[PDB]
Design a binder for this molecule. Structure first.
Ligand SMILES: [Ca+2]
Ligand SMILES: [Ca+2]
Lengths: 225, 214
């Protein structure tokens, strides 16, 4: 069975070089072409170029020529995509996809799983976790709202669970926002009953693997003058 | 390059509806038009090759049309699995160019947001930064405006927003807005308020608090 297996996620500082790979399983390498697609965060797909291993022919979209190099090792059926100096704007997901030769009829019937590339000034940093306490101005009707502010971390991702997985209904963990620092920041919230607040304990479990930071934070209510 | 203009950028429909996306090339591309579906966190999956060839396994409800410049995908009997993003791709000449995509949202009835404001925690204040947070919970449709106000002064450039994906169960959205100040500016001012406007509210709702009050 045909698989295109890509290399793992990358975090780099601007100006470093990077080479990501795509290994082809279950078909004869020289019989097809490998293509590279960029997909920047929250946007569409872009075709960067392609390599035909049978001929060593390499073709580029002109918007990428001279910023990246597509290559191949025939003996491992691997295609490469390479930058010599990264910019932060190269932050994106990169897919390889299989295609044909000039005049084929089927394109990108197979895709690798993608390689996320993050390019940034920032250095690895664990989050500070702050309570979003329930109160009276977080009391809808019989519905209260509480949560955790996971602030100032790098890179992505962090996970958040409530009551070591015991609490899952009403939970919203939002997309991180990148700060001018930055250093991402996100919040996880849950809606619970006003009455129970009271008698029930709420702790958020925050895991930032890149910095080997785990934190548990209790969210106790608050009293107003 | 052959430019491919896909439309609609976004689209709402109900399970069982019958939607159609269209892509227009700026150069002729005969029948060299392809269609992909992309679920989030996954790679694109091919649905239709050059000349409207349904790929082996693509369900009967998917279909394709066009020749020259104007091309259409058409999904009858929209099932739940089919809510995602769709892209078209011309394979007629280099560089390959994609449509900018179509995003498929479940249509449901209007729901007003539940709004909650959160003053900066005391732990955070002991480090010199204040983060005020405003939660808009479970609303539809997606459009919603947050206006932070500080002692009635409307704020700008002060905040960051983020929105969840559509909930699998209720098909609402939820929004978080964060107003970030230095601890110093925070203490300059008394009343901190979050003003939400949204089609499901006859008029804007405000949640407020007084610094110190709690
Ligand atoms: Ca053709
Ligand atoms: Ca052709």
């Amino acid at each position: 069975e045909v698989q295109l297996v890509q290399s793992g996620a990358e975090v780099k500082k601007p100006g470093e070089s990077l080479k990501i790979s795509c290994q082809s399983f279950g078909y004869i390498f020289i019989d097809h072409t490998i293509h590279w697609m960029r997909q920047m965060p929250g946007q569409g797909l872009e075709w960067m170029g392609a390599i035909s291993p049978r001929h060593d022919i390499t073709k580029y979209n002109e918007m990428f020529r001279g910023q990246v190099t597509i290559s191949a090792d025939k003996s491992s059926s691997t295609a490469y995509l390479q930058w010599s100096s990264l910019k932060a704007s190269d932050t994106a997901m990169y897919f390889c996809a299989r295609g044909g030769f000039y005049g084929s009829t089927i394109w990108f019937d197979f895709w690798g799983q993608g390689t996320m590339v993050t390019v940034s000034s920032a250095s690895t940093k664990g989050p500070s976790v702050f309570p979003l306490a329930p109160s009276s101005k977080s009391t809808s009707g019989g519905t209260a709202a509480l949560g955790c502010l996971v602030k100032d971390y790098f890179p992505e991702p962090v996970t958040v669970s409530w009551n070591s997985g015991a609490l899952t209904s009403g939970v919203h963990t939002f997309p991180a926002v990148l700060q001018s620092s930055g250093l991402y920041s996100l919040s996880s919230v849950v809606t619970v009953p006003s009455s129970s607040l009271g008698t029930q304990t709420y702790i958020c479990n925050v895991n930032h693997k890149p910095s080997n930071t785990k934190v548990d934070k209790r969210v106790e209510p608050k009293s107003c003058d | 390059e052959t430019t491919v203009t896909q439309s609609p950028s976004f689209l709402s429909a109900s399970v069982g509806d019958r939607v159609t996306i269209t892509c227009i090339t700026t150069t002729d591309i005969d029948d060299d038009m392809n269609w992909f579906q992309q679920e989030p966190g996954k790679a694109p999956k091919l649905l239709i090759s050059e000349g409207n060839i349904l790929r082996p396994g693509v369900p009967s409800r998917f279909s394709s049309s066009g020749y020259g410049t104007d091309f259409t995908l058409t999904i009858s009997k929209l099932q739940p699995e089919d809510f995602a993003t769709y892209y078209c791709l011309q394979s007629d000449n280099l560089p390959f160019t994609f449509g900018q995509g179509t995003k498929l949202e479940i249509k449901r009835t209007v729901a007003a947001p539940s709004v909650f404001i959160f003053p900066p925690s005391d732990e955070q204040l002991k480090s010199g930064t204040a983060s005020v947070v405003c939660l808009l919970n479970n609303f539809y449709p997606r459009e919603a405006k947050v206006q932070w106000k500080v002692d009635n002064a409307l704020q700008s450039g002060n905040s960051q927003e983020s929105v969840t994906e559509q909930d699998s169960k209720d098909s609402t959205y939820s929004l978080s807005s964060t107003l970030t100040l230095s601890k110093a500016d925070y203490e300059k001012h008394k009343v901190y308020a979050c003003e939400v406007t949204h089609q499901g509210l006859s008029s804007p709702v405000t949640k407020s608090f007084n610094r110190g009050e709690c």
